[PDB]
Design a protein around this ligand. Structure first.
Ligand SMILES: *[C@@H]1O[C@H](CO)[C@@H](O[C@@H]2O[C@H](CO)[C@@H](O[C@@H]3O[C@H](CO[C@H]4O[C@H](CO)[C@@H](O)[C@H](O[C@H]5O[C@H](CO)[C@@H](O)[C@H](O)[C@@H]5O)[C@@H]4O)[C@@H](O)[C@H](O[C@H]4O[C@H](CO)[C@@H](O)[C@H](O)[C@@H]4O)[C@@H]3O)[C@H](O)[C@H]2NC(C)=O)[C@H](O)[C@H]1NC(C)=O
Ligand SMILES: *[C@@H]1O[C@H](CO)[C@@H](O[C@@H]2O[C@H](CO)[C@@H](O[C@@H]3O[C@H](CO[C@H]4O[C@H](CO)[C@@H](O)[C@H](O)[C@@H]4O)[C@@H](O)[C@H](O[C@H]4O[C@H](CO)[C@@H](O)[C@H](O)[C@@H]4O)[C@@H]3O)[C@H](O)[C@H]2NC(C)=O)[C@H](O)[C@H]1NC(C)=O
Ligand SMILES: *[C@@H]1O[C@H](CO)[C@@H](O[C@@H]2O[C@H](CO)[C@@H](O[C@@H]3O[C@H](CO[C@H]4O[C@H](CO)[C@@H](O)[C@H](O)[C@@H]4O)[C@@H](O)[C@H](O)[C@@H]3O)[C@H](O)[C@H]2NC(C)=O)[C@H](O)[C@H]1NC(C)=O
Ligand SMILES: *[C@@H]1O[C@H](CO)[C@@H](O[C@@H]2O[C@H](CO)[C@@H](O)[C@H](O)[C@H]2NC(C)=O)[C@H](O)[C@H]1NC(C)=O
Ligand SMILES: *[C@@H]1O[C@H](CO)[C@@H](O[C@@H]2O[C@H](CO)[C@@H](O)[C@H](O)[C@H]2NC(C)=O)[C@H](O)[C@H]1NC(C)=O
Ligand SMILES: *[C@@H]1O[C@H](CO)[C@@H](O[C@@H]2O[C@H](CO)[C@@H](O)[C@H](O)[C@H]2NC(C)=O)[C@H](O)[C@H]1NC(C)=O
Ligand SMILES: *[C@@H]1O[C@H](CO)[C@@H](O[C@@H]2O[C@H](CO)[C@@H](O)[C@H](O)[C@H]2NC(C)=O)[C@H](O)[C@H]1NC(C)=O
Ligand SMILES: *[C@@H]1O[C@H](CO)[C@@H](O[C@@H]2O[C@H](CO)[C@@H](O)[C@H](O)[C@H]2NC(C)=O)[C@H](O)[C@H]1NC(C)=O
Ligand SMILES: *[C@@H]1O[C@H](CO)[C@@H](O[C@@H]2O[C@H](CO)[C@@H](O)[C@H](O)[C@H]2NC(C)=O)[C@H](O)[C@H]1NC(C)=O
Ligand SMILES: *[C@@H]1O[C@H](CO)[C@@H](O)[C@H](O)[C@H]1NC(C)=O
Ligand SMILES: *[C@@H]1O[C@H](CO)[C@@H](O)[C@H](O)[C@H]1NC(C)=O
Ligand SMILES: *[C@@H]1O[C@H](CO)[C@@H](O)[C@H](O)[C@H]1NC(C)=O
Ligand SMILES: *[C@@H]1O[C@H](CO)[C@@H](O)[C@H](O)[C@H]1NC(C)=O
Ligand SMILES: *[C@@H]1O[C@H](CO)[C@@H](O)[C@H](O)[C@H]1NC(C)=O
Ligand SMILES: *[C@@H]1O[C@H](CO)[C@@H](O)[C@H](O)[C@H]1NC(C)=O
Ligand SMILES: *[C@@H]1O[C@H](CO)[C@@H](O)[C@H](O)[C@H]1NC(C)=O
Ligand SMILES: *[C@@H]1O[C@H](CO)[C@@H](O)[C@H](O)[C@H]1NC(C)=O
Ligand SMILES: *[C@@H]1O[C@H](CO)[C@@H](O)[C@H](O)[C@H]1NC(C)=O
Lengths: 128, 431, 97, 130, 130, 130, 48
């Protein structure tokens, strides 16, 4: 029930790396995973990987394990059930094939068989 | 779908509440009467829990501040009332060369209601006032006076505050937690830690240090009329003493009424004072001016000065040392304008006729402590008070007493448990 | 740190007197009215809360560092000098006549 | 299981905190271990402990839940109370978040549970009248 | 139904007053909301409230009726207690009139209910011994 | 039977003393019948009476034994607690002799009874989820 | 009606010297003595 604003649409050239942010609000940042999804011009959508703001644990697709740099800060608690966190995103070997819109995504539940499912999405960040 | 309500008993949910907390122990504070503290202090960590605190709305400090005042009046009830001492005093100076403590004689009652006696005693000038040489005790035209029982202890004992059954105390293990806001790391305790009810002023003594860095509090730091509470992380050593070797004389003033007077001073006559390490106080005054820039600016000047006026209990460092109440001139501690072997000695006075707290109605006579007095304490806190542009001066203050216990009870909060929860699930009862 | 404008406001019984007051810091700003000879009178406090005994014509609004005070209908008694206040500082005044 | 302790799951899901009820069921009454300050103030606290406890047992008794830690009833879940899904409750928000959303309707539910019990022993009264 | 209130059916039939028991079951313990006159006298009244209440719960527990508002037992109705018909009781005299006629035998009945319960869990003790 | 009285079978076999439980179940709370010596000391004793009693009812409630004088459970008898035969217990040693031999393991058993009840209403919670 | 119930087959270890009823009563009489002399006249002027 909160927003997940990201960075702007920074366009670079292949070989370099791009930093993408994801500032949360309106929900406990440490209670839900942060997924990262992109939709490039050449494929459809592809699941990159999520990370736990509580356990600090990572799990990402083998197609992005040796490229993605994925970190999170620590939430600045506003109330008992509200906080403000941040999720970061970086790639390694960049090409024009990775040109697409990128967004972060808050996990679905806190327990069960769909704990990390991307429920609350960001806004989108246009890459190269 | 097929969802009916289902009652749950024993669910983790509480509410903000204020109840009558009871004390536990392991003297005036009657700590022998508290329940024996449990040797196993259970602390349960409340993982994933964030709670909103506020040390200024906190009620444990309002209840304790009355639980000490109600303990003071409770301990002086069976003690001797020094009402016949309110008699015309014939005083001289004690032979020396400043004439401070006097040498007063008076016609005093005896065990027989028809016999008088011409006894004498020593009184510090802070306890007497002239008529027009003739003197009288300071409290006579104000209130009655009760002499403290010389068998009760003035020593602060670790007192543990506990919440009753069905209630709980919420700790706060955040090592940079300023007074208000939401504590991210919260745990619950059945009882608070060992609270030492050290009655102090300006400089908080024997308190609990802070981990990591020294934080300062105050509810609204920009409101100059709010006492700023600074809490050191390293302890500055302060040594105090009354070097005079005093004597205590028992004066029978009735059937069982025995007023204890100051006989004479054996040996030298000197000056009561206190010491701090100027190096430790210089680096500690640096630690305080460090965090003061995070609220006022990285370029503004920070000035330290002494008190601006008021009563004796506030303009000086007042406390207890071996059983006698000092009043230490702290002008030598607050005299540094900050911008970007050692020993500082404070001249302290001594009073026996005090009212304490600030109540107008009763004063206490502290019987003199026999022998030479010296006590070693740590100053762990500080109660400052700022004074129209970009240069902030700071002076010590000690208006309200409950700021003392508040510097120790900021980590706690009272909540009541309501273990009744109603929630739906696909469940119904049979027929 | 308090800039109160205007300094003078010439109006007639029936108009609306609006007096602003810019502040550098943020806090609980208030307003006062001082009729000639009498003592100042608290009108608005904490920004928009109306004081006791004050008619509903007096109203205050806030948007950022700017605090405004408006009288819905001026009478022969509402003519005086008005001051804004935050902490211990006050404005230079605005005498309406 | 993990012995989280007293109120250990105050920030955990309602499905995880519901499986550790006998932990807060013990320390709600604690126990056992004459005129002074704390003396009168301790006895005042010891009486208040059993009063708030008996109210929760009296309320549980008149609902047919006397002796239950988890108790199922007949009152259906009104959507006006909370039109949330079953999965977004027991595997999401905590018992502290739940009590704030139900703080309004919590008094209506307490009355629906009472007559739902009286119109159950009265039905069983006729069920055993033959 | 008509919410008559607390003791609303004190002058009504025993059949009508028996269907509104959870009304007087709540206000028997009321609830929650230090040295003076009323202060000591209030705490003396708060203790007496829970004592008389626990006696009625202890008596209900040793009868097997713990948690019941209407409880059926095994003790047969002795005609010496009240040789009145079932219709001239539940649709006639009130619960106040009933207590005066049974005031004598009310102590014998309280003992018959106790052993009727002990010789029931003892029978069930053997019933589950296999 | 023989009305031996309160604690009449304190020196009798555990099988004979187990059939007279409602005798000591009554006088555990007794009953009903302001500033002096005994006055404050009587109220201090009246509060302690209901506290020790509610602890034994709270412990019985969280075991599923709320209302039982003899209560059967699920926890099996560990031979480390007492490797004695069933006939050398109920027809031999008394309840006083029994408590001394079980004084050690009596705290472990009290925890086994609690989770054996929570993992029973939780199983029944799923048993009625359909 | 002073109910006395016989504990048949019962043997108990006693000790009148560790007994606490005598320590409590001895204080319940001392606390009764001081409690009864509170409103009574103090003979302090008689010390003449
Ligand atoms: C405090 O609040 C936080 C945030 O809500 C809670 O953290 C969340 O807990 C829930 C339930 O405990 C988690 O959901 C589960 O997720 C696991 C996925 O983990 C598996 O895969 C991980 C990545 O591959 C891996 O790290 C795990 O391996 C272990 O090692 C890590 C090392 O860091 C260790 O930290 C882990 O704990 C693991 O033990 C693991 O292999 C998923 O498997 C779960 O599904 C199972 O369980 C459910 C029932 O819970 C069942 O229905 C399924 O069928 C399946 O059997 C389950 O979905 C969630 O991931 C956590 N993190 C979030 C939400 O960000 C924390 O528990 C709270 N603690 C307290 C004390 O309140
Ligand atoms: C506060 O003020 C009180 C006064 O109210 C002081 O108390 C007095 O102190 C003086 C000393 O400063 C005492 O005077 C001394 O008394 C001694 C007792 O002897 C008396 O009794 C014998 C009988 O046995 C008589 O023969 C004798 O004359 C005395 O009457 C004397 O022995 C002392 O004599 C000393 O002085 C003389 C003259 O200088 C010398 O020649 C002697 O050798 C000797 O050195 C002296 O006279 C007086 O008794 C005290 N009064 C009381 C009531 O106790 C306190 O001391 C003072 N306190 C402080 C801190 O200032
Ligand atoms: C801050 O805390 C300090 C320590 O916690 C306080 O210092 C204490 O002050 C009291 C009184 O001023 C002292 O009590 C005195 O005890 C000595 C005798 O003690 C010596 O002998 C015993 C053997 O029985 C030995 O164990 C000790 O270590 C000493 O060697 C007497 O002169 C008196 O009876 C007097 O009561 C404490 O001893 C002293 N503690 C320490 C550790 O120094 C200080 O007072 C506190 N400050 C404030 C303002 O409260
Ligand atoms: C104690 O000593 C002080 C200091 O000498 C005396 O103070 C003097 O008091 C007189 C009053 O008659 C003044 O005229 C002097 O100016 C004071 N002197 C100083 C330096 O302030 C005091 O009177 C002495 N007290 C007694 C009882 O002798
Ligand atoms: C004054 O100084 C320090 C404050 O840290 C205390 O001495 C240390 O106390 C801690 C905690 O008990 C011990 O772990 C250290 O070993 C102590 N240091 C030394 C050198 O002994 C001391 O107790 C304080 N006194 C007070 C607060 O009264
Ligand atoms: C302070 O004065 C007292 C007496 O006024 C001194 O006590 C004496 O101590 C010695 C031991 O060295 C004993 O032999 C004496 O009998 C004591 N005298 C009395 C009257 O009891 C004490 O030593 C002095 N202390 C200091 C530090 O000056
Ligand atoms: C306050 O007093 C204490 C105790 O007298 C002083 O600690 C002593 O310091 C010296 C010099 O370093 C050491 O030789 C002693 O061993 C210390 N005493 C103890 C008991 O450890 C302390 O230095 C004094 N501080 C001030 C500021 O005066
Ligand atoms: C506390 O000490 C300071 C100095 O350390 C005293 O300051 C004196 O103040 C008077 C005026 O009130 C001046 O005439 C003196 O010159 C000052 N002395 C010094 C050394 O600067 C101050 O008076 C002391 N406090 C009290 C209550 O006497
Ligand atoms: C002093 O108190 C004022 C009033 O409560 C605080 O002002 C608020 O500050 C917060 C945090 O920036 C803002 O969100 C509010 O809009 C402010 N309200 C007003 C009326 O000004 C102020 O923050 C406090 N001082 C400090 C240093 O925090
Ligand atoms: C005691 O009383 C007498 C009465 O004559 C008087 O002379 C003497 O001065 C009095 N004592 C004191 C110390 O005032
Ligand atoms: C304490 O911290 C909170 C947020 O971290 C802040 O809002 C509050 O103003 C701080 N307290 C003070 C006195 O500045
Ligand atoms: C404070 O310092 C000034 C300047 O030295 C001095 O005049 C004044 O008397 C001092 N006041 C106190 C209470 O020390
Ligand atoms: C829900 O509650 C409302 C009152 O808040 C009531 O009018 C309505 O009949 C209820 N509906 C159901 C289905 O329980
Ligand atoms: C409960 O009532 C208050 C009345 O002020 C309302 O503001 C609040 O929204 C209500 N609760 C819910 C969950 O709607
Ligand atoms: C009725 O009670 C009497 C004692 O009052 C008893 O002797 C008799 O056996 C009882 N009869 C029945 C049928 O219960
Ligand atoms: C109860 O006993 C009294 C004894 O005086 C008797 O008068 C009364 O009639 C008895 N009650 C009934 C209903 O018979
Ligand atoms: C008996 O208790 C011991 C601990 O005292 C435990 O290790 C063992 O598993 C238990 N065995 C049975 C059969 O209950
Ligand atoms: C209980 O523990 C004590 C520990 O000292 C031991 O002596 C005793 O034998 C134990 N009880 C039994 C029945 O073994």
């Amino acid at each position: 029930q909160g927003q997940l604003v990201q960075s702007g649409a920074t366009t670079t050239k292949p070989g370099s790396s791009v930093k993408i942010s994801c500032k949360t609000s309106g929900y406990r940042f440490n209670f839900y995973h942060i997924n990262w999804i992109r939709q490039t011009a050449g494929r459809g959508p592809e699941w990159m990987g999520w990370i736990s703001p509580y356990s600090g644990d990572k799990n990402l697709a083998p197609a992005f394990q040796d490229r993605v740099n994925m970190t999170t800060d620590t939430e600045v608690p506003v109330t008992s059930f509200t906080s403000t966190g941040a999720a970061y995103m970086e790639i390694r070997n960049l090409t024009s094939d990775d040109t697409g819109t990128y967004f972060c995504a808050k996990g679905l539940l806190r327990d069960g068989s769909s704990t990390w499912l991307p429920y609350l999405w960001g806004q989108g960040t246009l890459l190269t | 779908e097929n969802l009916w309500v289902t009652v749950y008993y024993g669910v983790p949910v509480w509410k903000d509440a204020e109840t009558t907390l009871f004390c536990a122990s392991d003297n005036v504070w009657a700590t022998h009467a508290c329940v024996p503290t449990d040797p196993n202090p259970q602390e349960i960590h409340l993982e994933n829990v964030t709670e909103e605190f506020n040390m200024w709305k906190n009620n444990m400090v309002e209840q304790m501040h009355t639980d000490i005042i109600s303990l003071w009046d409770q301990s002086l009830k069976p003690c001797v009332k020094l009402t016949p001492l309110c008699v015309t005093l014939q005083c001289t100076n004690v032979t020396n060369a400043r004439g401070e403590l006097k040498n007063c004689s008076f016609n005093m009652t005896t065990e027989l209601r028809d016999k008088k006696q011409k006894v004498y005693s020593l009184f510090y000038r802070l306890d007497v006032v002239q008529i027009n040489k003739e003197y009288r005790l300071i409290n006579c035209n104000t209130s009655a006076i009760t002499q403290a029982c010389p068998k009760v202890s003035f020593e602060p004992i670790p007192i543990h505050y506990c919440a009753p059954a069905g209630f709980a105390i919420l700790k706060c293990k955040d090592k940079k937690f300023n007074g208000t806001g939401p504590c991210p790391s919260v745990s619950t305790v059945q009882c608070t830690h060992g609270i030492k009810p050290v009655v102090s002023t300006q400089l908080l003594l024997n308190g609990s240090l802070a981990e990591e860095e020294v934080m300062i509090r105050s509810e609204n730091i920009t409101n100059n009329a709010k006492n700023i509470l600074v809490q050191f992380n390293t302890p500055v050593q302060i040594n105090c003493t009354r070097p005079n070797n005093n004597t205590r004389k028992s004066i029978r003033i009735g059937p069982g009424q025995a007023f204890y007077a100051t006989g004479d001073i054996i040996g030298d006559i000197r000056q009561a004072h206190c010491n701090v390490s100027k190096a430790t106080w210089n680096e500690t005054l640096g630690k305080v001016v460090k965090q003061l820039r995070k609220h006022f600016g990285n370029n503004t000047i920070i000035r330290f000065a002494n008190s601006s006026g008021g009563d004796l209990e506030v303009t000086t460092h007042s406390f207890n040392c071996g059983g006698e109440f000092f009043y230490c001139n702290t002008s030598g501690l607050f005299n540094s304008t900050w911008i970007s072997n050692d020993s500082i000695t404070l001249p302290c006075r001594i009073k026996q006729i005090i009212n304490m707290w600030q109540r107008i109605g009763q004063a206490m006579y502290a019987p003199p402590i026999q022998g030479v007095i010296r006590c070693v304490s740590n100053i762990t806190g500080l109660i400052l008070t700022r004074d129209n542009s970009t240069t902030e001066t700071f002076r010590p203050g000690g208006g309200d007493m409950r700021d003392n216990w508040r510097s120790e009870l900021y980590k706690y909060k009272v909540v009541k448990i309501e273990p009744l929860g109603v929630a739906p699930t696909r469940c119904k009862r049979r027929v | 740190v308090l800039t109160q404008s205007p300094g003078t406001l010439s109006l007639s019984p029936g108009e609306t007197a609006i007096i602003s007051c810019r502040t550098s810091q943020y806090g609980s700003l208030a307003w006062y009215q001082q009729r000639p000879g009498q003592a100042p009178r608290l009108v608005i406090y904490s920004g928009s809360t109306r004081a006791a005994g004050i008619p509903d014509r007096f109203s205050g609004s806030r948007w950022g560092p700017d605090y405004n005070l408006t009288i819905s209908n001026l009478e022969s008694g509402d003519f005086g000098v008005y001051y804004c206040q935050q902490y211990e500082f006050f404005g230079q005044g605005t005498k309406v006549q | 299981a993990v012995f989280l302790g007293f109120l250990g799951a105050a920030g955990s899901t309602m499905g995880a905190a519901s499986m550790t009820l006998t932990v807060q069921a013990r320390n709600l009454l604690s126990g056992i271990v004459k005129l002074t300050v704390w003396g009168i103030k301790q006895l005042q606290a010891r009486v208040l402990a059993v009063e708030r406890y008996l109210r929760d047992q009296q309320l549980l008794g008149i609902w047919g839940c006397s002796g239950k830690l988890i108790c199922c009833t007949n009152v259906p879940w009104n959507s006006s109370w909370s039109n949330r899904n079953l999965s977004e409750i027991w595997d999401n928000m905590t018992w502290l978040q739940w009590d704030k959303e139900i703080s309004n309707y919590t008094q209506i539910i307490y009355g629906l549970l009472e007559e739902s019990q009286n119109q159950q022993e009265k039905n069983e009264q006729d069920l055993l009248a033959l």
